[PDB]
């Protein structure tokens, strides 16, 4: 392909359906995205284990094999944004423990198996989009105590189960926007620690989500393209770190005399 | 009106979620019938009457057989299988750690 002196070797340009060979197993980095890979052959990566960042992007990747990410201990970065598998890839994840960034996010996504996210330990950002969701994975996420930024954008995620997200404290940044969230539950955020950005921004809700004033730590509040009529006073009363709440855009009645303190 | 046998031996014994997935040269792989530890089978809508599974957990040996040949059928076919338990079972390629060969099969 064109090796760099980074050992950061780009093939995206050759429209090849297969794993670059002959490359050096020395480089770091390997983006991929003008190819069309549309299956992962297994042990395709046995070549060269010395890489980090696998930048494999809108190949119409249909299948991976389970193997076909074994002795990949090096890899940190995975970024298979754009491609067509359906579930996650349970089996070929299952096995990364230097993994910290899996993008999985415009591959349509109708499920995810249980045992999905398992011995992943270095996660700390993933995103899943743009795939019809319709269950918050409640197990599956239970598995990754040590993520910082988590995206749920595009889906058809109707509610949040209580407490469905609880083990994953280290969480920082929460993303729940483009999707039609009906209601939640008062105990769906309990356990939620130091989370800065929590969006809500066009999931229609009833009236307002109580569940907010379980964590103490919180800075911004993004709700503003739902539909919602009365903001009960003292709302935002066990958040006193808030900067900026985005709050246009509905067809709010009465906000309450009560409704803004010691921000 | 064909067998397709797959000899198990990966595993020891216990199989579970033992299932046949036919691919389509140039689409994705997806599952036809699977079966469970305890007999349980699921099919897909194509497959719902036209064909069936067997399996012996004695001999340890996956068994399908397939009825009313049709030309769409024709395909690259495949045998998985799971050992660890602890997945709800179902017509997905993400929870099988061991896939077969595979035989390609048309119809007469």
């Known amino acids: 392909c064109s090796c760099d002196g980074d050992r950061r070797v780009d093939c995206s340009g050759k429209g090849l359906t297969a794993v670059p060979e002959g490359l050096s197993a020395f480089t770091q980095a390997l983006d991929i995205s003008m190819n069309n890979i549309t299956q992962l052959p297994e042990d395709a990566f046995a070549n060269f284990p010395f890489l980090e960042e696998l930048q494999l992007a809108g190949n119409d990747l249909s299948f991976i094999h389970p193997k076909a990410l074994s002795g990949l201990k090096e890899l940190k970065v995975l970024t298979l944004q754009n491609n067509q598998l359906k579930t996650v890839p349970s089996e070929a994840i299952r096995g990364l423990s230097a993994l910290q960034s899996l993008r999985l996010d415009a591959n349509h996504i109708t499920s995810v198996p249980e045992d999905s996210f398992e011995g992943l330990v270095q996660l700390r950002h993933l995103w899943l989009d743009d795939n019809s969701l319709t269950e918050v994975p409640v197990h599956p996420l239970s598995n990754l105590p040590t993520l910082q930024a988590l995206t749920l954008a595009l889906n058809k995620i109707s509610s949040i189960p209580d407490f469905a997200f609880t083990n994953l404290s280290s969480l920082v940044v929460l993303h729940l926007h483009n999707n039609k969230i009906r209601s939640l539950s008062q105990h769906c955020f309990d356990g939620l620690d130091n989370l800065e950005t929590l969006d809500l921004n066009y999931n229609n809700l009833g009236e307002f989500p109580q569940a907010i004033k379980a964590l103490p730590s919180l800075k911004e509040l993004g709700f503003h393209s739902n539909s919602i009529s009365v903001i009960p006073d003292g709302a935002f009363d066990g958040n006193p770190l808030l900067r900026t709440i985005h709050l246009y855009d509905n067809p709010l009645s009465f906000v309450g005399n009560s409704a803004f303190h010691n921000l | 009106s064909l067998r397709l046998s797959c000899a198990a031996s990966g595993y020891t014994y216990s199989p579970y979620c033992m299932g046949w997935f036919r691919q389509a040269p140039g689409k994705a792989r997806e599952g036809v019938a699977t079966?469970?530890?305890?007999?349980?089978?699921i099919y897909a809508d194509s497959v719902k009457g036209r064909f069936t599974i067997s399996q012996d957990n004695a001999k340890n040996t996956l068994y399908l057989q397939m009825n009313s040949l049709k030309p769409e059928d024709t395909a690259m076919y495949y045998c998985?299988?799971?050992?660890?338990?602890?997945?709800?079972?179902?017509?997905?390629?993400?929870?099988?750690?061991?896939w077969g060969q595979g035989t390609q099969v048309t119809v007469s």
């Open positions: 998985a299988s799971r050992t660890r338990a602890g997945v709800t079972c179902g017509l997905n390629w993400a929870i099988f750690s061991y």
């Open positions: 079966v469970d530890l305890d007999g349980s089978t």
